[PDB]
């Protein structure tokens, strides 16, 4: 018969094995601890409900299951997919574990039947007449529903849960025709609720429903066979048959504008399946007489082969390079252990409840769980000892959780399950206030600040009124595609669908079109943005990305394998990366040119090394994976350099200490879950923490006797702040103050030693003017969002800025910059076979003064070491160390002198706290996102002060500090802002090289952030 979905993993688009289809269609999620989901199943091959069928002859929930009796000897259950399940002749106090179905079948009384899917659901069954009808559900906490029936007509009127009550009504042939269900307003009186209406026709067919919001779905049907079903928004996939029989096998689907289509072939002599889809590429499934796969035949030649179990689990799957995953498993269908590729070995332990009791890793460490006599996890334990505590109410709802550091949270619930409070460590109450129907209305944070929602006729939300006073407004179709979006400033961005439900259109606040196109078979074929280029997507039969054509018509491809599948070669234009993989599909060597990366792993698939020509780093790890120690070896330039960092965790794997290369000793002194609360350098604390309920830094004692102080808004955005003498009496005082539009851009700062900043956006939050220091900037943008032009007091198709305010730009064949010329400086620029800054030559116009740089990179593309060669001026051989992804300290070897400088950062953002070098410390004061605006030494003096252009430039400020924004580098030598992975021009505030992320990350491969005065961070947008 028909396969059971229990055993294989893709059997089927509509149904592979026979044919069938079977969709699913919601009405109504009434909210509970027990939920009451009245999901509608159709299955073309149930004969079971045609005669009497609640909803029709093909249609069954989980409300409407039936255990039929046999001619002889036996029972068949119509499970919620509508699959009749055979089951044994069970006599009175016999219990039989279905293998082939994975069911635990108790004969609990002589006109009962009960029936549990391994204890995460239990269905008992009551005998009335020739058909064992559903009695309840039951939950692994005991949770139940409860299915009431007429006395006369035995049709089931109604169901019951702990808070909750639906009523059916039924018309003259026992079908549903309205859903009723009682609720209450704010008070008072009781109030009943349509929640579905259900349309028959001639045939007896269900053809139209409709749910608790008035959306409709329509069906039409050939001998009950269905040939269209449409979604709430009308839009319809399409059908067609081998026959009228029950047991006809569907030959075609197709959306209603015809795309999609799938074809299906049957080899009933070989008992195998052809799909065929839009672009007649053919996957060849093989079954076994069971009707299970055992091969895959794919559209690129490969064939996959799955080993079988007699009790049909997968024990073997075998990959088309002969790779192997194992599986063994116990008496009760539980997999016991996984032999990798490679035969590394995961393995698990059960109970008679089929719950998960130790886990093994191929490491062999040890993870363990324990729960109580009811089903719930009580406790869980890790390889080094620590225990996290679970307690559970009767209803089954986590009530409470203990941390392995003691860290007790809390939650509460109200009578429909739904999380109304929940507390940190710390006991920061987070709230949510909920609708009569179940739907969040109130969302209060843990400083009181409340975010409330309003919902629209189809029962998404419809705005977002946040404290601030701003509000967003949404528009959804009936099946929860957003329409449109309107900002708190009027601002509209539309959004268009295609006859299939495919994202077609994107339409800006500036009303610029971006469309989205596709080829026959639904995937993405083709981009078009807002300057009119092109983006174009190829594929292969098996949808592997073989080759793109950019907005810029760069041609990339991506040359797959065959039997792996693995990426062995991607070429750029007049480029070619070659790729090296284990059986585990680890890439182990990154070959191009002159450069070679390569990395090894451990049996745990962490990379214990990474080493090229330059750098060779290893890395040690605890049985938690936490980077317990690295060893950094350098060879650049001529010179050894080995730095060593240890680092000490805490049982939440939170870092309390770190040994850093230098010699000193960094000490994080958390509270609660890991907030940092203080910081020790050496044996001496350079800074202190006082953190309000959202955990954000209110206070920062300073070891320089300074105390900074920072007011945040009702959102979260930044107030103020302040810089005041925490010791002295008269504490005087440096401050700013931030001033926000609706939308949340920053639209004036008001600082104490400067005046006015005032920041003036269009219609896509895009920084136009700045002013400032009684001159003002002004910016210019094509439609593709590329800065056309910039001053202060055509379209660039294909999104190369080749020209900007009196700036000229020449690039490379990869789209990365090569050569600029502003008026009195020319630049030129070399990249390395990886996509990398290796070399840069400034000449002065003015003095005709040569300079050269190069630059090197770890395996991970964080640029370890660079030397400044002047003409005549010495050389300078810098060392850059990495704390992840933080610079740890920079290292300058200019002849016999050497300068070390070390960098501390908040530890989730790149917000720069400290520079110390000596044992002296100095203290950063940033902005709002980070960019370093002051530096405080030991003795309190503002020793460095920073100025910026509207992008970001440090312009003549009214030691020193190399830090700016948010983890960008100010390399002096070309001008340039190295940021993390790519490099940032601040006289253009684009990146000169395109984004290694792709399409992913933004449609420009330059832009950097539209606003450049706020809503910036390293990797931008």
Same mark, same amino acid.
């Given at each position: 018969?028909?396969?059971?979905?229990?055993?294989?993993?893709?059997?089927?688009?509509?149904?592979?094995?026979?044919?069938?289809?079977?969709?699913?269609?919601?009405?109504?999620?009434?909210?509970?601890?027990?939920?009451?989901?009245?999901?509608?199943?159709?299955?073309?091959?149930?004969?079971?409900?045609?005669?009497?069928?609640?909803?029709?002859?093909?249609?069954?929930?989980?409300?409407?299951?039936?255990?039929?009796?046999?001619?002889?000897? !036996?029972?068949?259950?119509?499970?919620?997919?509508?699959?009749?399940?055979?089951?044994?002749?069970?006599?009175?106090?016999?219990?039989?574990?279905?293998?082939?179905?994975?069911?635990?079948?108790?004969?609990?009384?002589?006109?009962?039947?009960?029936?549990?899917?391994?204890?995460?659901?239990?269905?008992?069954?009551?005998?009335?007449?020739?058909?064992?009808?559903?009695?309840?559900?039951?939950?692994?906490?005991?949770?139940?529903?409860?299915?009431?029936?007429?006395?006369?007509?035995?049709?089931?009127?109604?169901?019951? *849960?702990?808070?909750?009550?639906?009523?059916?009504?039924?018309?003259?042939?026992?079908?549903?025709?309205?859903?009723?269900?009682?609720?209450?307003?704010?008070?008072?009186?009781?109030?009943?609720?349509?929640?579905?209406?259900?349309?028959?026709?001639? +045939?007896?067919?269900?053809?139209?429903?409709?749910?608790?919001?008035?959306?409709?779905?329509?069906?039409?049907?050939?001998?009950?066979?269905?040939?269209?079903?449409?979604?709430?928004?009308?839009?319809?996939?399409?059908?067609?048959?081998?026959?009228?029989?029950?047991?006809?096998?569907?030959?075609?689907?197709?959306?209603?504008?015809?795309?999609?289509?799938?074809?299906?072939?049957?080899?009933?002599?070989?008992?195998?399946?052809?799909?065929?889809?839009?672009?007649?590429?053919?996957?060849?499934?093989?079954?076994?007489?069971?009707?299970?796969?055992?091969?895959?035949?794919?559209?690129?030649?490969?064939?996959?082969?799955?080993?079988?179990?007699?009790?049909?689990?997968?024990?073997?799957?075998?990959?088309? %390079?002969?790779?192997?995953?194992?599986?063994?498993?116990?008496?009760?269908?539980?997999?016991?252990?996984?032999?990798?590729?490679?035969?590394?070995?995961?393995?698990?332990?059960?109970?008679?409840?089929?719950?998960?009791?130790?886990?093994?890793?191929? #490491?062999?460490?040890?993870? *363990?769980?324990?729960?109580?006599?009811?089903?719930?996890?009580?406790?869980?334990?890790?390889?080094?000892?620590?225990?996290?505590?679970?307690?559970?109410?009767?209803?089954?709802?986590?009530?409470?959780?203990?941390?392995?550091?003691?860290?007790?949270?809390?939650?509460?619930?109200?009578?429909?399950?739904?999380?109304?409070?929940?507390?940190?460590?710390?006991?920061?109450?987070?709230?949510?206030?909920?609708?009569?129907?179940?739907?969040?209305?109130?969302?209060?944070?843990?400083?009181?600040?409340?975010?409330?929602?309003?919902?629209?006729?189809?029962?998404?939300?419809?705005?977002?009124?946040?404290?601030?006073?701003?509000?967003?407004?949404?528009?959804?179709?009936?099946?929860?595609?957003?329409?449109?979006?309107?900002?708190?400033?009027?601002?509209?961005?539309?959004? &268009?669908?295609?006859?299939?439900?495919?994202?077609?259109?994107?339409?800006?606040?500036?009303?610029?079109?971006?469309?989205?196109?596709?080829?026959?078979?639904?995937?993405?074929?083709?981009?078009?943005?807002?300057?009119?280029?092109?983006?174009?997507?190829?594929?292969?039969?098996?949808?592997?990305?073989?080759?793109?054509?950019?907005?810029?018509?760069?041609?990339?491809?991506?040359?797959?394998?065959?039997?792996?599948?693995?990426?062995?070669?991607?070429?750029? &234009?007049?480029?070619?990366?070659?790729?090296?993989?284990?059986?585990?599909?680890?890439?182990?060597?990154?070959?191009?040119?002159?450069?070679?990366?390569?990395?090894?792993?451990?049996?745990?698939?962490?990379?214990?090394?990474?080493?090229?020509?330059?750098?060779?780093?290893?890395?040690?790890?605890?049985?938690?994976?936490?980077?317990?120690?690295?060893?950094?070896?350098?060879?650049?330039?001529?010179?050894?350099?080995?730095?060593?960092?240890?680092?000490?965790?805490?049982?939440?794997?939170?870092?309390?200490?770190?040994?850093?290369?230098?010699?000193?000793?960094?000490?994080?002194?958390?509270? !609660?879950?890991?907030?940092?609360?203080?910081?020790?350098?050496?044996?001496?604390?350079?800074?202190?923490?006082?953190?309000?309920?959202?955990?954000?830094?209110?206070?920062?004692?300073?070891?320089?006797?300074?105390?900074?102080?920072?007011?945040?808004?009702?959102?979260?955005?930044?107030?103020?702040?302040?810089?005041?003498?925490?010791?002295?009496?008269? *504490?005087?005082?440096?401050?700013?103050?931030?001033?926000?539009?609706?939308?949340?851009?920053?639209?004036?700062?008001?600082?104490?030693?400067? #005046?006015?900043?005032?920041?003036?956006?269009?219609?896509?939050?895009?920084?136009?003017?700045?002013?400032?220091?009684?001159?003002?900037?002004?910016?210019?943008?094509?439609?593709?969002?590329?800065?056309?032009?910039?001053?202060?007091?055509?379209?660039?198709?294909?999104?190369?800025?080749?020209?900007?305010?009196?700036?000229?730009?020449?690039?490379?064949?990869?789209?990365?910059?090569?050569?600029?010329?502003?008026?009195?400086?020319?630049?030129?620029?070399?990249?390395?076979?990886?996509?990398?800054?290796?070399?840069?030559?400034?000449?002065?116009?003015?003095?005709?003064?040569?300079?050269?740089?190069?630059?090197?990179?770890?395996?991970?593309?964080?640029?370890?070491?660079?030397?400044?060669?002047?003409?005549?001026?010495?050389?300078?051989?810098?060392?850059?160390?990495?704390?992840?992804?933080?610079? +740890?300290?920079?290292?300058?070897?200019?002849? %016999? +002198?050497?300068?070390?400088?070390?960098?501390?950062?908040?530890?989730?953002?790149?917000?720069?706290?400290?520079?110390?070098?000596?044992?002296?410390?100095?203290?950063?004061?940033?902005?709002?996102?980070?960019?370093?605006?002051?530096?405080?030494?030991?003795?309190?003096?503002?020793?460095?002060?920073?100025?910026?252009?509207?992008?970001?430039?440090?312009?003549?400020?009214?030691?020193?500090?190399?830090?700016?924004?948010?983890?960008?580098?100010?390399?002096?030598?070309?001008?340039?802002?190295?940021?993390?992975?790519?490099?940032?021009?601040?006289?253009?505030?684009?990146?000169?090289?395109?984004?290694?992320?792709?399409?992913?990350?933004?449609?420009?491969?330059?832009?950097?952030?539209?606003?450049?005065?706020?809503?910036?961070?390293?990797?931008?947008?």
């Amino acid at each position: 018969a028909d396969c059971k979905e229990c055993r294989g993993r893709v059997g089927g688009s509509i149904g592979l094995d026979v044919g069938d289809e079977r969709f699913s269609h919601l009405d109504f999620v009434l909210p509970g601890v027990f939920p009451l989901e009245w999901n509608r199943t159709y299955r073309s091959n149930m004969t079971a409900k045609d005669g009497q069928g609640e909803l029709g002859p093909r249609w069954i929930t989980a409300f409407t299951l039936v255990v039929l009796p046999l001619e002889t000897g !036996g029972y068949e259950y119509i499970s919620e997919v509508g699959r009749a399940v055979s089951v044994i002749e069970l006599e009175p106090g016999q219990e039989w574990y279905d293998r082939t179905e994975e069911l635990i079948w108790r004969r609990p009384d002589v006109d009962t039947l009960e029936v549990s899917q391994k204890y995460q659901r239990t269905e008992t069954f009551e005998r009335s007449g020739d058909v064992f009808r559903l009695k309840t559900i039951a939950d692994r906490a005991g949770n139940q529903a409860q299915l009431i029936y007429d006395a006369e007509n035995g049709f089931l009127v109604r169901v019951e *849960t702990a808070i909750q009550t639906v009523h059916l009504d039924h018309d003259a042939h026992g079908r549903i025709t309205t859903i009723w269900h009682e609720v209450t307003g704010d008070d008072g009186t009781p109030l009943r609720r349509t929640l579905a209406r259900y349309q028959y026709d001639e +045939a007896h067919d269900l053809v139209a429903a409709v749910d608790q919001y008035e959306r409709t779905h329509t069906y039409a049907y050939q001998n009950h066979l269905i040939t269209r079903y449409s979604d709430k928004t009308g839009r319809g996939i399409n059908l067609e048959w081998d026959g009228d029989h029950p047991q006809a096998k569907c030959v075609r689907e197709y959306r209603d504008d015809g795309s999609n289509l799938l074809r299906f072939r049957w080899d009933e002599s070989e008992s195998k399946t052809y799909v065929t889809d839009a672009l007649s590429a053919t996957t060849v499934y093989t079954f076994d007489a069971h009707n299970y796969i055992i091969h895959i035949d794919f559209a690129d030649g490969t064939r996959q082969s799955r080993i079988r179990d007699e009790f049909h689990n997968i024990v073997e799957v075998r990959y088309p %390079d002969d790779s192997f995953e194992k599986y063994e498993y116990d008496e009760f269908d539980n997999i016991l252990k996984l032999t990798r590729a490679d035969h590394t070995t995961v393995g698990w332990e059960y109970d008679q409840y089929s719950q998960i009791t130790k886990i093994v890793d191929p #490491g062999g460490n040890i993870w *363990t769980r324990d729960y109580d006599q009811f089903g719930n996890m009580i406790r869980e334990t890790d390889p080094k000892g620590h225990t996290s505590e679970f307690q559970y109410t009767a209803e089954g709802l986590l009530i409470q959780s203990v941390n392995p550091a003691g860290g007790v949270s809390t939650l509460s619930y109200n009578p429909a399950g739904l999380l109304i409070r929940y507390s940190d460590c710390s006991n920061k109450t987070r709230r949510w206030e909920y609708d009569l129907l179940g739907r969040t209305v109130k969302q209060t944070d843990p400083c009181g600040n409340a975010e409330s929602y309003e919902y629209n006729r189809y029962g998404f939300i419809n705005e977002v009124r946040r404290p601030d006073g701003s509000v967003l407004t949404l528009d959804f179709d009936e099946e929860g595609r957003l329409l449109s979006f309107i900002d708190p400033i009027d601002n509209l961005t539309v959004y &268009a669908y295609d006859g299939a439900g495919r994202l077609a259109r994107k339409t800006d606040p500036l009303k610029q079109d971006f469309h989205y196109n596709y080829d026959k078979k639904g995937r993405l074929a083709s981009l078009q943005d807002e300057n009119g280029a092109q983006f174009t997507f190829q594929f292969d039969p098996v949808d592997r990305l073989i080759r793109t054509v950019g907005f810029d018509g760069k041609v990339k491809k991506y040359n797959y394998d065959k039997p792996t599948g693995l990426l062995f070669s991607m070429e750029d &234009a007049d480029r070619e990366t070659h790729f090296e993989y284990d059986v585990m599909g680890q890439l182990l060597k990154r070959r191009a040119g002159h450069l070679v990366d390569s990395f090894e792993y451990d049996i745990s698939n962490r990379i214990i090394r990474a080493h090229n020509e330059y750098c060779d780093q290893h890395f040690e790890y605890d049985v938690l994976n936490n980077p317990i120690r690295e060893t950094h070896i350098y060879n650049a330039f001529g010179q050894n350099r080995e730095y060593v960092w240890e680092n000490e965790f805490d049982e939440l794997s939170n870092r309390l200490t770190t040994r850093r290369p230098s010699g000193e000793k960094v000490s994080w002194l958390r509270y !609660g879950a890991g907030h940092v609360h203080g910081i020790l350098l050496d044996d001496q604390e350079v800074l202190s923490f006082e953190r309000d309920n959202s955990h954000r830094a209110v206070r920062k004692r300073q070891s320089n006797s300074l105390l900074a102080v920072t007011n945040y808004d009702v959102m979260g955005r930044v107030k103020e702040q302040k810089l005041n003498l925490a010791q002295g009496n008269r *504490t005087n005082l440096r401050s700013r103050q931030y001033a926000y539009g609706l939308d949340g851009s920053l639209v004036a700062i008001e600082d104490s030693r400067h #005046g006015t900043t005032t920041y003036r956006y269009d219609a896509l939050d895009r920084l136009v003017s700045a002013t400032a220091f009684n001159e003002t900037e002004l910016f210019a943008f094509d439609p593709a969002s590329n800065l056309v032009d910039r001053d202060k007091t055509s379209k660039v198709l294909g999104n190369i800025l080749k020209r900007c305010a009196g700036m000229h730009f020449e690039y490379d064949a990869q789209g990365n910059l090569i050569r600029k010329r502003k008026p009195d400086s020319l630049q030129e620029f070399e990249w390395d076979e990886f996509g990398r800054l290796r070399k840069t030559v400034n000449t002065d116009l003015n003095s005709k003064h040569v300079s050269e740089a190069e630059y090197i990179y770890d395996t991970f593309d964080r640029r370890i070491g660079k030397v400044n060669q002047q003409e005549t001026s010495g050389a300078a051989v810098t060392f850059y160390g990495w704390d992840g992804h933080h610079l +740890a300290f920079e290292e300058s070897t200019v002849g %016999d +002198a050497v300068d070390k400088t070390h960098y501390l950062y908040e530890e989730n953002s790149f917000v720069p706290l400290i520079q110390y070098q000596h044992l002296s410390v100095s203290h950063y004061q940033c902005d709002h996102i980070g960019t370093p605006q002051l530096l405080t030494d030991d003795n309190g003096h503002i020793v460095w002060e920073g100025r910026y252009s509207a992008l970001g430039k440090q312009l003549d400020s009214i030691g020193q500090n190399n830090l700016c924004y948010q983890g960008q580098y100010y390399d002096r030598e070309s001008g340039l802002h190295y940021n993390r992975f790519r490099y940032y021009d601040p006289d253009i505030g684009r990146f000169i090289q395109q984004d290694p992320i792709g399409l992913f990350g933004d449609s420009n491969f330059y832009t950097y952030a539209p606003n450049t005065a706020n809503w910036i961070d390293p990797f931008g947008l």
